[PDB]
């Protein structure tokens, strides 16, 4: 016999620990795997896919949930009017929960990276006009009016021309720890603020829909991270 | 920031509790000092939602058996956990010649000894398991149900001819390893109705996530 | 989709649309000569270089437009607000990014521009007989901006019909939403006050009125996100 | 006279008297293996590396001696108190510096020493029948220290007659005053808690009782100044 002294942790079972143990079926040769199109190797691949951002997450009615996918723009709105507004909070509840990005974050404790919202105008072809999308980094509350909003990073979007514009959120870091009621989860804090404004009124010729909708597509950029796992899932498996 | 915590193996690792057998000295449930547990990785609540992120998966699993008394006490009782390779018949009595058949891997351990652990290879005769099957495996409704996805069956029991002396509770933990996923699909957003299919409440459809007042008011 | 991450902030903005670099110059630090020659000005690269996301303004069928004043807008909220308050001299470039979340069923156009030394002028009484220099609300409208009362004359007798002669970018809803402008430090002095003199103003006016067939969220949110490029300060207090 | 200045602090300490380096090892960071292998621990070089000057204790003809517990002592006051509170794992060396302002007309001797894992033990009731583990006041006496009740047995049945077997330094008034000790991180774990387990204790006992012919300030101030050498933390909360 070769000399051995046992160290603490002997006979111990750590759910995370991953050493090994014998195969229940030694001589079993698991049918080889063939080639299945589109394998995933790291969830972060997914976090870069654009998914529909339910910015219009207001109608809760059962047969309206489909409206949450898009917000509208129309003749009724006059220049300057604020169209919509949401936060850069891929994690936290809000419009982001609809995106795959969001849903994955929920399975993680903290993260950071650059985001990328896209806006698709689905109105008539004959429709024209300018919308002003503006991002206000953490802190500076939602710009008072359209004017002042423009004095900061913004993009004037013209659907008369390009029917789809993309805005990049510089960086959001959900790492600034916190402790609410008892759910001491690393609260964003870094809630950027995207606001979309009516730069010009909605313009359409006689014969076209005097109201259109805009779909929003978000997704994180290449430089996105996720740290710590958290199996928080309200949708759980139930025995028939 | 190392993107390693976002891999597939780092997402699906970690020993989770998937089974909890119960051998009460006397009562209703498992009145024969033994019970048959079918390997079901959904024994872990939030697991379903997760794996179901993909359409095809491949993996192995390391099962661990933490058994004690309901109180949490350790006792000098010897147990035998047996594995029923999908295809072989399971025990039906406290001495069905099933526990005898060698082709059914058994593993004896006392409660004195630390948890027992073993590895089950990727069973399925297919290239991979598949959480979804849009068809019928060539009276009754056999839809969505995929045959070959059966990982096997663990049959726990108190060694010996006579019943056990103390009440026992065997908890079964399983950590899957070496995972490969394919065809990512939308993330479940409606509560689950049955372990079987993806049916959902046909009226109680709620929005993917919380809602607000007006789209302009944050 | 591609989220830029420069700081403890992470905006999920478009991959890389078109950005108008102001007056054709990237904001930089400084050669080796200023309003301080035996005073090497510390250049905040720490938390003074992250993303700030101002409280989104709501665009209505009637918004007259808004405006913010730099550097004031941020001397409020932020560690950049910490610097601008505890320091005497200041020099800093910028980079604004205005985003607009709306649907393909809406429509409008916003003219977003940067106007150096944006001096306001109220009604001057009512008809025009009162040398009342605008309130401390119009000269430095914090981080929540301020609305134009006379969009046509940009509140300073200058026609907006010509505002494009400044670093600007359009935001036509049917064609885009996000718009970007990189502003370089523009002043007649190397180092100027960061609390009393506002190097410029950011305007964002609805040139083509917002509109939507009845039933769509009537207010489209305009999210202004900005990043301080090459901050510089001298002598703390 | 020569004042050392490492941080926004400036102690006007002696030019360079004698300092006892603990167990003969300068506190350092770490090779490339710890209680965190896929977790590169950020090393606070910022404000976590400056001079801290604890509230001077007054030495009387009767002081029984005092003691502090590291890292606790500072988790209180300081940005190093910020770190030790918002971080999980911790590893840090030190450098204490005890000074004594007195006149050539006073006299005394202080034994200053570092004792790893300094476990206290109160009276155990009164005579010795009560398993009462000392209060949360003796286990972590903040930044104001705590007094010995039984200096002879260092409050732990160990004879002070042998305390010199630890990193120590004497402070005999007629010969000096300032004394220094550089403590290296001493633990049975690479990274340990910085809030519950106190890596050690700093004792400072009057072995030769303070004294002065009547008429001199009877209380001589002992000023403990310390500097965190090679702070290290992992995972914030």
Automatic annotation (TrEMBL), chain A:
It is found in: Host cytoplasmic vesicle membrane; Host nucleus; Virion. This is Genome polyprotein. Cysteine protease that cleaves viral polyprotein and specific host proteins. It is responsible for the autocatalytic cleavage between the P1 and P2 regions, which is the first cleavage occurring in the polyprotein. Also cleaves the host translation initiation factor EIF4G1, in order to shut down the capped cellular mRNA translation. Inhibits the host nucleus-cytoplasm protein and RNA trafficking by cleaving host members of the nuclear pores. Counteracts stress granule formation probably by antagonizing its assembly or promoting its dissassembly. Capsid protein VP2: Forms an icosahedral capsid of pseudo T=3 symmetry with capsid proteins VP2 and VP3. The capsid is 300 Angstroms in diameter, composed of 60 copies of each capsid protein and enclosing the viral positive strand RNA genome. Belongs to the picornaviruses polyprotein family. Capsid protein VP1: Interacts with capsid protein VP0, and capsid protein VP3 to form heterotrimeric protomers. Five protomers subsequently associate to form pentamers which serve as building blocks for the capsid. Interacts with capsid protein VP2, capsid protein VP3 and capsid protein VP4 following cleavage of capsid protein VP0.
């Amino acid at each position: 016999g070769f000399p051995t002294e046992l160290k603490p942790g002997t006979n111990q079972f750590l759910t995370t620990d991953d050493g090994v143990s014998a195969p229940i079926l030694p001589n079993f040769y698991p049918t080889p795997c063939i080639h299945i199109p589109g394998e995933v190797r790291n969830l972060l691949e997914l976090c870069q896919v654009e998914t529909i951002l339910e910015v219009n997450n207001v109608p809760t009615n059962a047969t309206s949930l489909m409206e949450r996918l898009r917000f509208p723009v129309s003749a009724q709105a006059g220049k300057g009017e604020l169209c919509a507004v949401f936060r850069a909070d891929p994690g936290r509840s809000g419009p982001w929960q609809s995106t795959l990005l969001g849903q994955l974050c929920g399975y993680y404790t903290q993260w950071s990276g650059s985001l990328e919202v896209t806006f698709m105008f689905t109105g008539s072809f004959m429709a024209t006009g300018k919308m002003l999308i503006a991002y206000t980094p953490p802190g500076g509350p939602l710009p008072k009016d359209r004017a002042t909003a423009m004095l900061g990073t913004h993009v004037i979007w013209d659907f008369g021309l390009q029917s789809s514009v993309t805005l990049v959120i510089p960086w959001i870091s959900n790492t600034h720890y916190r402790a609410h009621a008892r759910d001491g989860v690393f609260d964003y804090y870094t809630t950027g603020l995207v606001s979309i404004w009516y730069q010009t009124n909605y313009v359409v010729p006689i014969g076209a829909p005097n109201t259109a909708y805009i779909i929003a597509l978000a997704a994180a950029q290449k430089n996105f991270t996720m740290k710590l796992c958290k199996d928080a899932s309200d949708i759980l498996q139930t025995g028939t | 920031h190392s993107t390693a915590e976002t891999t597939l193996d780092s997402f699906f690792s970690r020993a989770g509790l998937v089974g909890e057998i119960d051998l009460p000295l006397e009562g209703t449930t498992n009145p024969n000092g033994y019970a048959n547990w079918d390997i079901d990785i959904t024994g872990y609540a939030q697991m379903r939602r997760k794996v179901e992120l993909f359409t095809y998966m491949r993996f192995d699993a390391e099962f661990t058996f933490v058994a004690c008394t309901p109180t949490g006490g350790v006792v000098p009782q010897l147990l035998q956990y047996m594995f029923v390779p999908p295809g072989a018949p399971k025990p039906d009595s406290r001495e069905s010649l099933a526990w005898q058949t060698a082709t059914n891997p058994s593993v004896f351990v006392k409660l004195s000894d630390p948890p027992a652990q073993v590895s089950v290879p990727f069973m399925s005769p297919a290239s991979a398991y598949q959480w979804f099957y849009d068809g019928y495996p060539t009276k009754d409704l056999e839809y969505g149900a995929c045959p070959n996805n059966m990982m096997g069956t663990f049959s726990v029991r108190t060694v010996g001819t006579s019943k056990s002396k103390y009440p026992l509770v065997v908890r079964i933990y399983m950590r899957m390893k070496h995972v490969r996923a394919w065809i990512p699909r939308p993330m479940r957003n409606q509560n689950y109705l049955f372990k079987a299919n993806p049916n959902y409440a046909g009226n109680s459809i709620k929005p993917t996530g919380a809602s607000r007042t007006a789209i302009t008011t944050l | 989709v591609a989220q830029l991450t420069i700081g403890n902030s992470t905006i999920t903005t478009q991959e890389a649309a078109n950005i108008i670099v102001g007056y054709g110059e990237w904001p930089s630090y400084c050669s080796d000569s200023d309003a301080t020659a035996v005073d090497k000005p510390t250049r905040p690269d720490v938390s003074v270089n992250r993303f700030y996301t101002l409280d989104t303004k709501l665009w209505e069928k009637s918004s007259k437009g808004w405006y913010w004043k730099f550097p004031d807008v941020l001397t409020e909220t932020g560690v950049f607000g910490q610097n601008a308050q505890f320091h005497y001299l200041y020099r800093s470039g910028f980079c604004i990014h205005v985003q607009c979340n709306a649907s393909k069923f809406h429509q409008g156009a916003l003219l977003v521009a940067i106007l150096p030394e944006y001096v306001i002028g109220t009604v001057a009484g009512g008809t025009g007989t009162e040398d009342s220099h605008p309130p401390y609300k119009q000269t430095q409208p914090g981080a929540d901006g301020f609305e134009l009362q006379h969009p046509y004359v940009l509140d300073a007798g200058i026609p907006i019909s010509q505002l494009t002669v400044c670093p600007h970018q359009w935001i036509n809803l049917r064609t885009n939403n996000c718009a970007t402008i990189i502003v370089p430090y523009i002043n007649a002095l190397p180092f100027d006050s960061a609390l009393n003199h506002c190097n410029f103003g950011l305007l964002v006016v609805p040139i083509s009125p917002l509109d939507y067939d009845q039933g769509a969220t009537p207010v489209i949110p305009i999210t202004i996100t900005l990043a301080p490029m090459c901050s510089e300060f001298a002598g703390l207090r």
